[PDB]
Symmetry: C2
């Protein structure tokens, strides 16, 4: 599954649910969930946070590292454990319904990224 | 089966093929793969000029194949980007024979191997 019962998305970077494709869609849906521009704050730049960022931007949201509408907490250990704030069990259900064709923006409608 | 213009560049509207997130991911994956296999550089590096949807989508693919990226300069391969309505991507060093090799990988039905875990590259702002 994408989200644990505790409400987190975890795994080994590169393996589902942390594939570039799925992380990209998680990001698309997160921005969409907030629109239906939004801003995501990530703690660091790595494969996982960046794949999530590209999707968030593709949907018209902007991301920064240092904090906006949604903030990502990440703990890198045996596995990666991601937590979004704020995201209730309701937000998570809304998300799950979107992920399971999420529209995308193009050209200048695409969000930005700031280191 | 090609994306490079007769001028040795890739052009398009961000979000529209060949500049979709999916395709850019694949371009990044293929570029890194080309450097590891053809140039025999085990951990190639890509330098991007700035951070936006196109350069980052490209970076994710590059890292997924085992390469590392930095914003600035110094890498084995460096990206030159012209923005605007139609983005224009140029890589250096990328010869015409390199472009053919790259496209062969991009349009090939053969899967482009992906690395995982500790083997995925890093990103430096």
């Amino acid at each position: 599954a994408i989200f644990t019962h505790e409400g987190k998305v975890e795994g080994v970077p590169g393996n589902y649910p942390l594939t570039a494709e799925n992380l990209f869609r998680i990001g698309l849906a997160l921005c969409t969930l907030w629109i239906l521009e939004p801003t995501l704050s990530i703690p660091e730049t790595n494969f996982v946070t960046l794949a999530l960022s590209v999707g968030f931007m593709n949907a018209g949201g902007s991301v920064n590292v240092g904090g906006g509408d949604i903030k990502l907490f990440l703990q890198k250990g045996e596995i990666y454990v991601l937590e979004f704030q704020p995201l209730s069990e309701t937000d998570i259900k809304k998300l799950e319904s979107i992920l399971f064709p999420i529209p995308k923006k193009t050209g200048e409608d695409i969000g930005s990224f700031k280191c």
